Amino acid sequence: FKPLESYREDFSFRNSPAAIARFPFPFPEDQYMYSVNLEPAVSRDPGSVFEHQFDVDEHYVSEMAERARVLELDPGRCLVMPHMAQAAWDTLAMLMEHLARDYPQHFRLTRQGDAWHWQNLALGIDQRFTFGDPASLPCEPLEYITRQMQGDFAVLDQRDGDLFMDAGMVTCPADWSLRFDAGMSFKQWHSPVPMAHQMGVFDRALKYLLNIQVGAPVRRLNWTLTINPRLDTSPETYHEWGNDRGKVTPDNVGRLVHLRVELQLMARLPRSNALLFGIRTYLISLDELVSNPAWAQRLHRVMRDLPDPIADYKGITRYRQTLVDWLRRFDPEA
Ligand code: HEM
Numbered sequence: 095f096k097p098l099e100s101y102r103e104d105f106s107f108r109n110s111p112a113a114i115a116r117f118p119f120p121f122p123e124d125q126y127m128y129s130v131n132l133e134p135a136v137s138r139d140p141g142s143v144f145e146h147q148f149d150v151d152e153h154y155v156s157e158m159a160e161r162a163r164v165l166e167l168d169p170g171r172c173l174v175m176p177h178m179a180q181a182a183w184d185t186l187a188m189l190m191e192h193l194a195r196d197y198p199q200h201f202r203l204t205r206q207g208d209a210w211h212w213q214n215l216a217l218g219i220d221q222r223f224t225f226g227d228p229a230s231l232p233c234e235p236l237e238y239i240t241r242q243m244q245g246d247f248a249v250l251d252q253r254d255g256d257l258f259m260d261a262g263m264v265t266c267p268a269d270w271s272l273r274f275d276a277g278m279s280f281k282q283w284h285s286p287v288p289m290a291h292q293m294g295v296f297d298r299a300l301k302y303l304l305n306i307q308v309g310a311p312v313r314r315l316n317w318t319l320t321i322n323p324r325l326d327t328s329p330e331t332y333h334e335w336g337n338d339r340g341k342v343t344p345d346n347v348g349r350l351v352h353l354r355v356e357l358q359l360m361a362r363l364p365r366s367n368a369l370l371f372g373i374r375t376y377l378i379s380l381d382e383l384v385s386n387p388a389w390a391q392r393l394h395r396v397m398r399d400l401p402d403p404i405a406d407y408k409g410i411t412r413y414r415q416t417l418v419d420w421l422r423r424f425d426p427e428a
């Protein structure tokens with residue numbers, strides 16, 4: 095854990111060379127198109143973000159401080175409908191188990207029956223509590239555990255052949271809101287997305303997710319861009335960030351424009367049968383990213399050729415020409 099970084103104000107967030115090397119670059123081809131890009135979420139590539147189900151990295155402490163700040167200002171970024179309380183406990187169990195198993199230097203879990211002992215040495219938390227008893231924790235169980243894991247989480251109720259967004263912790267969204275989407279179904283919350291409905295992508299994706307079973311979780315990557323390493327790109331806070339999209343110039347692309355990648359986990363929760371959706375969000379500046387000449391060239395092509403409805407949906411319009419011009423310098427064939 096490096097010294098405390100900000101994702102707001104002075105934006106002191108930066109990647110080490112190791113964090114650059116393991117950034118989940120999300121483009122398998124020189125152009126991007128939506129698809130059902132799901133795979134089994136099996137451990138692979140030691141040191142990579144695909145090694146564990148829940149990835150904890152050098153920015154862990156920084157990110158939990160940012161989450162704490164978002165929540166100080168807006169506690170309503172976390173919602174658990176009453177029927178999702180058991181799902182919220184399942185979530186806490188799954189996170190604590192995996193974290194204590196995968197990062198034993200930082201986390202520990204000892205249990206006897208519902209008497210649990212959790213230590214988070216990274217954040218200096220030493221908690222004896224009762225599993226299932228919300229009065230034994232200093233807050234609601236989803237909020238308790240997600241204040242201690244990177245990325246966002248939605249918790250979906252599976253009923254009536256559909257998935258409903260009935261709980262979550264959403265403090266670093268790519269321009270959407272859990273309070274808006276609360277209680278929506280899978281096609282409904284995806285209603286703003288261009289093209290993918292007509293292509294069948296959301297039909298097929300629902301069908302795959304509905305069949306996810308215990309111990310066979312699934313993953314995919316999503317991506318966008320963000321000006322500055324701003325994690326809280328929410329509607330709630332638009333006045334704080336939306337105007338930065340007007341500040342990009344040919345001289346500052348490399349410092350301002352960041353590639354934002356979500357490593358998404360879909361895992362069946364065993365007591366409730368709810369589906370956990372982990373949104374693990376990574377940020378990299380274009381200066382950092384162009385370290386890697388292959389990534390630079392490929393990003394140039396992707397951004398040059400991206401369908402305009404996708405570009406526009408992703409919020410990249412206002413600065414896209416400046417960006418493409420900048421990136422062209424890293425593409426010899428162009
Ligand atoms: C329970 C699982 C999921 C949740 C909670 C979720 C949630 C969301 C949300 C809230 C958005 C933003 C919509 C907006 O603009 O307001 C979104 C966008 C999107 N989702 Fe999902 N989603 C899930 C699973 C899937 C899967 C499996 C796919 C498979 C292809 C997918 C594809 C997309 C696409 C293509 C976009 C637009 C993203 C972009 O262009 O950057 N989602 N999702």
Ligand code: NA
């Ligand atoms: Na393809």
